[PDB]
């Protein structure tokens, strides 16, 4: 699904309270960092002689996933972000 | 303007619609009897449960025998055998309804108090017709028993009272 | 044969007044529609029609019996006010609508009829918008934007009221043909009403 590379979506910022063209960037999930509260648990829990200690999800059924779109008005840094429908090939242009 | 409806089949295996109409007729047992006046709305209730009832148009004599012999007032929820006219004036606080003759006129002439009267009577508990029925399964004109049998109910209902 | 007996069976006659061709109903059903929350308080409609000889402006509100025509201002009555000629031109529509707007206030936050173009195309400067601009200028709070006034440039989003004023005053027909003063005189003579 082709998506515009820019959109005048509405802006919650006080500086705005208005429609503004938003620089669209696709949301790609950030790196899974080591010292996340719950990675430290999983690591502590994987220390020792129980093998795997938590389930590892294996069987995906979804082929697609929701395409979060981070946005940001020219005016300021704040990144409004909004979901779309599932697509096998999001690609803004 | 008045039918003496009589439940004629027993209380087993009866459907929810017939089963309600019989309760509203106060025909909860077998040979119970009530006088119900023949409104269209009643004629459509009676038409709904005719296999469960025999009925017709009571003679003044049929009315006397039921009210005098089988007549029972509801009193404080008690089923009270009629025995005094004192008993009747107390039940019916009604300058119109004092005699047991007041009652027989109401449940025969069709009354302005036909409900005020017949409701204060416990539904009649008749004995099974002496000499038997014919077939509680067929309609009267089929050579059976149930359903409207016009003025003939007086005979049938006479053997019972 | 397309129109056999089976055709007239399954055929559903459209509404008489659409079948007659005299009314748009997607518009009639929106022009007439108002919030139900409004228990049914009046919603007047400035229906305006250009019968080929003469203009018709008609303040109106819908009713189930058939809509009431509260007030009307036919161009026929212009000559009663000194406009003896051009009784269907843009210069006249302004005074027709300004007339109904002024004959309607004569009974009576501003009164707010909304324009009912009917089927007329809303090209810029169409005579129908002259009835509005006349009536709107005459008192009624007809909602509108200058986009279809004559003298309103598409490119450059702004009206040329020095031009819009001209066609209102009948200068419009001057170049295709002293009248300009008989309309200003025409207008005082309809406020004299």
């Amino acid at each position: 699904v082709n998506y515009p590379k820019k959109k005048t979506m509405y802006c919650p910022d006080a500086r705005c309270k208005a429609h503004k063209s938003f620089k669209v960037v696709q949301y790609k999930a950030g790196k899974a960092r080591l010292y996340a509260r719950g990675k430290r648990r999983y690591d502590r829990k994987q220390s020792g002689y129980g093998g795997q200690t938590k389930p590892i999800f294996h069987k995906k059924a979804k082929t697609t996933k929701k395409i979060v779109l981070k946005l940001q008005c020219s005016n300021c840094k704040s990144i409004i972000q909004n979901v779309l429908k599932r697509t096998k090939h999001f690609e803004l242009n | 303007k008045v039918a003496v409806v009589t439940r004629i089949r027993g209380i087993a295996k009866v459907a929810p619609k017939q089963r309600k109409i019989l309760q509203l007729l106060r025909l909860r047992q077998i040979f119970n009897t009530v006088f119900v006046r023949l409104n269209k709305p009643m004629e459509n209730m009676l038409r709904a449960v005719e296999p469960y009832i025999a009925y017709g148009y009571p003679s003044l004599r049929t009315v006397r025998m039921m009210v005098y012999k089988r007549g029972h007032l509801k009193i404080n929820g008690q089923r009270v055998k009629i025995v005094n006219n004192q008993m009747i004036e107390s039940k019916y606080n009604n300058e119109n309804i004092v005699c047991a003759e007041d009652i027989v006129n109401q449940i025969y002439t069709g009354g302005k108090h036909f409900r005020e009267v017949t409701n204060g009577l416990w539904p009649f508990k008749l004995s099974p017709p002496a000499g038997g029925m014919r077939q509680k399964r067929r309609h009267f004109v089929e050579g059976g028993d149930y359903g409207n049998r016009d003025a003939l109910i007086n005979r049938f209902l006479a053997r019972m009272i | 044969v397309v129109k056999n007996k089976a055709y007239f069976k399954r055929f559903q006659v459209k509404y008489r007044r659409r079948r007659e061709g005299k009314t748009d109903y997607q518009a009639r059903r929106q022009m007439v529609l108002q919030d139900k929350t409004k228990f049914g308080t009046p919603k007047y409609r400035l229906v305006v029609r250009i019968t080929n000889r003469d203009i018709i402006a008609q303040v109106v509100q819908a009713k189930v019996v058939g809509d009431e025509v509260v007030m009307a201002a036919y161009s026929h009555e212009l000559p009663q006010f000194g406009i003896q000629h051009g009784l269907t031109n843009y210069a006249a529509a302004y005074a027709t609508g300004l007339l109904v707007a002024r004959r309607m206030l004569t009974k009576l936050f501003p009164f707010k009829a909304i324009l009912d173009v009917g089927l007329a195309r809303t090209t810029t400067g169409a005579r129908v918008f002259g009835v509005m601009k006349g009536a709107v200028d005459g008192g009624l709070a007809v909602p509108h934007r200058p986009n279809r006034f004559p003298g309103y440039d598409k490119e450059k989003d702004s009206l040329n009221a020095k031009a819009h004023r001209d066609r209102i005053l009948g200068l419009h027909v001057a170049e295709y043909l002293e009248l300009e003063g008989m309309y200003k005189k025409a207008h005082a003579a309809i406020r004299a009403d």
Binding site: - | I11, R19, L22, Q23, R28, Q29 | -
Partner: protein, 192 residues
Amino acid sequence: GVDLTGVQKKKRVVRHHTYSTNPYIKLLIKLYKFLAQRTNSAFNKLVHQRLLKSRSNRAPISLSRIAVCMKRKSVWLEKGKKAPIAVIVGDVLDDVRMARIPALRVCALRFSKSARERITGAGGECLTFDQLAMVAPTGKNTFLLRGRKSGRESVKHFGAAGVPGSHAKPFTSNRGKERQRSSARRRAFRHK
């Protein structure tokens, strides 16, 4: 041989005797059972049935709530009409939130030591059902009252909490255990 359909469902469950082991309730039921039967008064019929209730269903009343309900009753009384006795079939409890109360004449099964002293500090009598019967054998200007029971913490638990309309209180030793994010919660309100 009778339709009985819907007859049993109409049977009512009522107490006909007190479960109270207390001797005095039984002398007190002995009175108002009598007095309720031998008088035409509807007051004796209420004091007699309430007297048969559970201590659950005989909720205590605040002396605060008598002083309120009483003056609110008595303020309208035409001059020269002394105020009604404030009978309750239950305990009467002192209220710290109302330091000064009117010379009430309350009549109840039981009084807190605090209620009884505040009641007499105002000069009001703190009489029992014994002399209630001896002064108002009939409920003559008695003002029969009940203590509250909706604010009772047992009923805060009624229903489910998880069911959307509900504001039932979940059962929990741990207040923080079933605490929940605003997102995940049942809808608070819901039309019946």
